[PDB]
Amino acid sequence: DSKHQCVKLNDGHFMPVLGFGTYAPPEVPRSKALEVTKLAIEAGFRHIDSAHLYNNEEQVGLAIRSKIADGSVKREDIFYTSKLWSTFHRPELVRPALENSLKKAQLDYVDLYLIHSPMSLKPGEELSPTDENGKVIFDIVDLCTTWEAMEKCKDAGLAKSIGVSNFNRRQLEMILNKPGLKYKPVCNQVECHPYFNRSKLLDFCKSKDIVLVAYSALGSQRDKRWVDPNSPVLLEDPVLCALAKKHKRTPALIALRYQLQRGVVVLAKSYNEQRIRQNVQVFEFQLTAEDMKAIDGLDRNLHYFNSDSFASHPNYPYS
Ligand SMILES: NC(=O)c1ccc[n+]([C@@H]2O[C@H](COP(=O)([O-])OP(=O)(O)OC[C@H]3O[C@@H](n4cnc5c(N)ncnc54)[C@H](OP(=O)(O)O)[C@@H]3O)[C@@H](O)[C@H]2O)c1
Ligand SMILES: CC[C@@H](C(=O)O)c1ccc(-c2ccc(C)c(F)c2)c(C(F)(F)F)c1
Numbered sequence: 294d295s296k297h298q299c300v301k302l303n304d305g306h307f308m309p310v311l312g313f314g315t316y317a318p319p320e321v322p323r324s325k326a327l328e329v330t331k332l333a334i335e336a337g338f339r340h341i342d343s344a345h346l347y348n349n350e351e352q353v354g355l356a357i358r359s360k361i362a363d364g365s366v367k368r369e370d371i372f373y374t375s376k377l378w379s380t381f382h383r384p385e386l387v388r389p390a391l392e393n394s395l396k397k398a399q400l401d402y403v404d405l406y407l408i409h410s411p412m413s414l415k416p417g418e419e420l421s422p423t424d425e426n427g428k429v430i431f432d433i434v435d436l437c438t439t440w441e442a443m444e445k446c447k448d449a450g451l452a453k454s455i456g457v458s459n460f461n462r463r464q465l466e467m468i469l470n471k472p473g474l475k476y477k478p479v480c481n482q483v484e485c486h487p488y489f490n491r492s493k494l495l496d497f498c499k500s501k502d503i504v505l506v507a508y509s510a511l512g513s514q515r516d517k518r519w520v521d522p523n524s525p526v527l528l529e530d531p532v533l534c535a536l537a538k539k540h541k542r543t544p545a546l547i548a549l550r551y552q553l554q555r556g557v558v559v560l561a562k563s564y565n566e567q568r569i570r571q572n573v574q575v576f577e578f579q580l581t582a583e584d585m586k587a588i589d590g591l592d593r594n595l596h597y598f599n600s601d602s603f604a605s606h607p608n609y610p611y612s
Pocket of ligand 1: 509
């Protein structure tokens with residue numbers, strides 16, 4: 294089926310080009326992640342994006358287990374992604390972090406394990422370690438050694454594929470130029486949308502056989518902790534809205550289809566049954582070449598996540 298279209302990764306594995314985003318803010322009860330991940334699988338999502346940080350791998354794993362038990366899907370039909378959180382970058386912490394995620398989700402392996410971010414944080418139990426003055430505490434880790442620990446996780450069969458997230462070109466090149474590299478990252482999961490389309494990074498990744506995976510492809514959830522309320526709302530963009538009317542679709546569907554036609558694997562978060570099912574209709578239509586150029590013109594270099602807690606980190610990927 295067209296809905297189960299995949300891209301071949303540089304390690305031979307396959308990744309579905311449309312993925313379900315599972316992050317919800319901590320004020321959303323965890324029971325919802327369980328309910329909506331089941332809804333996503335029912336609608337035809339097979340790529341599910343989670344992370345230790347999201348405090349939901351148990352619920353996402355329960356949803357997968359439930360849909361396997363009622364015969365909707367086999368484990369082999371699901372592409373499950375987890376992410377190493379930034380307090381676990383030190384190489385001796387990597388494999389135990391992955392094994393803990395597997396235990397929470399009650400899975401035997403992940404299809405994809407990512408370094409969540411290059412911005413290392415102080416090791417410990419707290420996900421957001423902070424000093425007496427409230428500032429998040431940074432750590433300094435050679436991410437090449439983190440990657441070597443990820444490579445051992447793939448060789449152990451705990452992760453079918455490994456990749457990175459929120460890396461810029463310089464940080465990617467550091468991994469790719471590493472002496473004795475065994476596995477290249479299969480992907481780089483980054484913020485990517487018509488207001489921040491990452492064409493330069495996309496061209497770099499294409500030249501290296503690295504898939505760019507787009508998050509916040511619908512403009513982010515605009516969480517007040519990190520998103521400026523005065524930033525423009527992506528789905529209210531006049532060009533996207535006119536394209537939605539011309540195609541008799543929605544602005545969200547235009548934004549998702551834009552990514553598929555430029556070779557980007559796209560994530561979409563929804564906790565609403567009707568929008569979850571609408572988002573799978575991205576395979577039903579096509580943007581013209583002129584439509585694509587129009588959307589290409591919307592780039593504003595706008596990353597919705599903006600905070601001096603990020604920007605002061607030595608490994609902050611933007612500039
Ligand atoms: N690697 C990283 O650092 C990183 C960072 C950010 C995100 N991610 C991952 O990418 C996923 C998606 O990114 P995101 O969380 O920023 O959200 P997003 O995909 O950009 O979606 C933002 C909002 O769009 C709404 N939406 C979904 N479908 C819609 C539709 N058809 N029409 C209108 N609105 C629609 C959703 O609200 P409703 O729920 O109300 O439908 C959602 O809250 C995340 O959940 C996470 O899995 C990863
Ligand atoms: C809270 C949602 C969560 C998710 O859904 O993954 C998320 C969202 C954005 C970022 C983020 C922000 C700024 C910069 C520069 C970055 F590189 C990554 C992170 C990260 F990586 F910092 F943890 C995590």
